[model samples]
Target: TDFDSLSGTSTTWVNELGSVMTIDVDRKGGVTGYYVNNAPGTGCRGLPYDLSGHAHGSTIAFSVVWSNGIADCRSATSWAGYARKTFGGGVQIVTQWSLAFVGKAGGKIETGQNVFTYQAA
Candidate 1:
């Protein structure tokens, strides 16, 4: 991680589904966080899930495994992108995610872009 990275900082974001992600970037660019999944389609509307990621320069990558509960809502997802400085003195993360359901939950992979804006603590 270089000085250009967003290390040693914590940021919060809410997805369109209203899910919450509280992320912390360590000095080594390692990420640790929790995700509140409010957008579950397979009967897994549970609480926060653990996440891990890493940042390089202004770019970052993170993911979560929804295996906290049963087979219904089990899956793993990852997002990769960079951080952008918003015009209004805010920070935004522009990422594209790859999500996949476990086992027979889904046979195809899902992809989408998530534009995350900074949420006040």
Candidate 2:
């Protein structure tokens, strides 16, 4: 059975600090998992603290939390956000996002846009 195009796709973002974040979508359009690496010695690297959420037509929303674990060496942090794209029947998805993060030091909220191109494997 064919699923939504967003399913099984991975999207990545690289911050100025060189932290790389990749979000993986499940077949049902919800977030399945994520990985983050905060530039090697920044003390942030992990698979996920925790993840949950769902998606609807043209939009995918989810929440992710990370903890300071030996596996990934990250501090406790959480992010809740949504990504929306216009339906264009193309491999490229230009998405807009609104996200909020909470950490031990404090919290932050921001909005941005990203482009994701599907890779068939």
Candidate 3:
């Protein structure tokens, strides 16, 4: 489904908390990386999260391993995020995602879902 088309695109992610952030996807060869923005006052404001994952057809999934002493908002023991194309027309692409976060604190977990629409350039 032309997964390569997703590279170098930008999308808006609105989490369950109604917080809005931006995501920029970079792809080279078969590897994908994500640059995430932590909206202002969100405790993650300038702290970005880096994820590595694979994309198959229309689905892309990635994870992050946590380590102690990392930035507060990005310091999660484990993180899993999934995104897939759900709708599209012309140059517009609509994708949905399920993002899960496991806090540094024992057994603390939070899961959120978001829908993003991107206008491919």
Candidate 4:
């Protein structure tokens, strides 16, 4: 499953001028920030979650936190815009992942089933 494939290591940036930030998840889901390259802006612009090598899932719930100068916009607005699409089922089933970007602002998630039966034993 692609969703499962997306469930690995990932990196995130605070902004265009921002450096490659660090991310770590805690046992209680709380995150600890050792050092942030840019202090003036907010990091982890969204859910504080990474999907680099992670797989896709049926139900995905996450957030994106970012900054807009003095006021850092959290949630979907912080990263311009976001969306997710779904499709497929039956014998030959598979899912496709797609993304849309708007000048590093907009993002989207599209999912679809394959043309084969995927029976989990």
Candidate 5:
């Protein structure tokens, strides 16, 4: 494995911080974010949009379909403070959920996955 490629990928994911999860933006020019369990408060409900003001019985599932990459990706991060505000300080984000990825770009490429299981740490 090329360490350079690994590093680049790492940086990519890192740069994705605060811009790739439920609290961020999807910066991949053509990439998008989708939500399944949450409600749309500010933008569309799927792909490159956020669903805020979520109510009970709401869930979210996201998909990132890229026009310039060899992989699709999904990632999520929940705020403990936010959960405490909403769930009374007893709930945590769970990773028991599953996601599916499909290749769409026509190139030899690599992909990464970041599945976050969170607790009030």
Candidate 6:
């Protein structure tokens, strides 16, 4: 977990569906990043969204905004989880997320899990 700790370098992580995110963690647990969604039918695939959160110790809480800059999706997602070590000394973020898809009529929240591993974003 100290690979780039205290440095301003960004780390990449990818999920099962191939969604990517690059997070830059500051020394004091300030997290800033970009996330790209790949889930089909979301209408925002391949588009980069803003990510902001805080990380302390092994716990991480973050959110992504799907405002449809180049697409037509309007939603917001939040992830709350902690980092766990793999059997081979790797890092995996086992997170639970809830997404709210907003429409003219109303909106609904969808919940799911996305485990992330170190990889390309």
Each candidate: what lDDT?
0.76, 0.49, 0.44, 0.29, 0.27, 0.82
By lDDT, the best candidate is: 6
Better of 2 and 3 by TM-score: 3
lDDT tens digits, residue span 2-111, model 1 = 32455677778887666788888887778898877776564445577888988778788999887665434656889998778877777777889998875664465789
Candidate 4 regions with alpha-carbon error over 4 angstroms: 11-56, 68-121
Clashes of each: 0, 1, 0, 32, 11, 0
Q: Tens digit of lDDT per residue, candidate 6, span 1-121?
A: 6433524768899998789999888877888889998976666789888899988877889998887467756788899988877887678889999998977789889999999998633
- Winning candidate number (TM-score): 6
Q: Tens-digit lDDT track for model 2 on 16-104?
A: 43444455667767765554545444454544345455655655555444453446432333334333333674343344445455668
Q: Residue by residue across 1-121, what tens digits does model 4's lDDT show?
A: 3223323323233323332333333333332232122423434432333321111243222223343344433332111111233355312212232323233556554332212222232
Per-candidate TM-score against the hidden true structure: 0.82, 0.44, 0.48, 0.22, 0.22, 0.88
Q: In model 6, which range of ten residues has the least summed lDDT?
A: 1-10
**Model 2 regions lying over 4 Å from their true place:** 1-29, 37-50, 71-90, 98-106
Query: Model 4 Cα displacement at 24 (Å)?
Result: 9.5
Per-residue lDDT tens digits for candidate 3, residues 16-51, read 433333444566524333434443444544444555
lDDT of 2 at 79: 35
Question: Which residue runs does candidate 3 get wrong by more than 4 Å?
Answer: 2-29, 39-41, 64-70, 77-105, 119-121
Worst 10 residues of 2 by lDDT: 73-82
Please say which candidate is ahead in lDDT: 5 or 6.
Answer: 6
Give, for candidate 1, the lowest lDDT window spanning 10 residues: 1-10
**Order by lDDT, highest first:** 6, 1, 2, 3, 4, 5
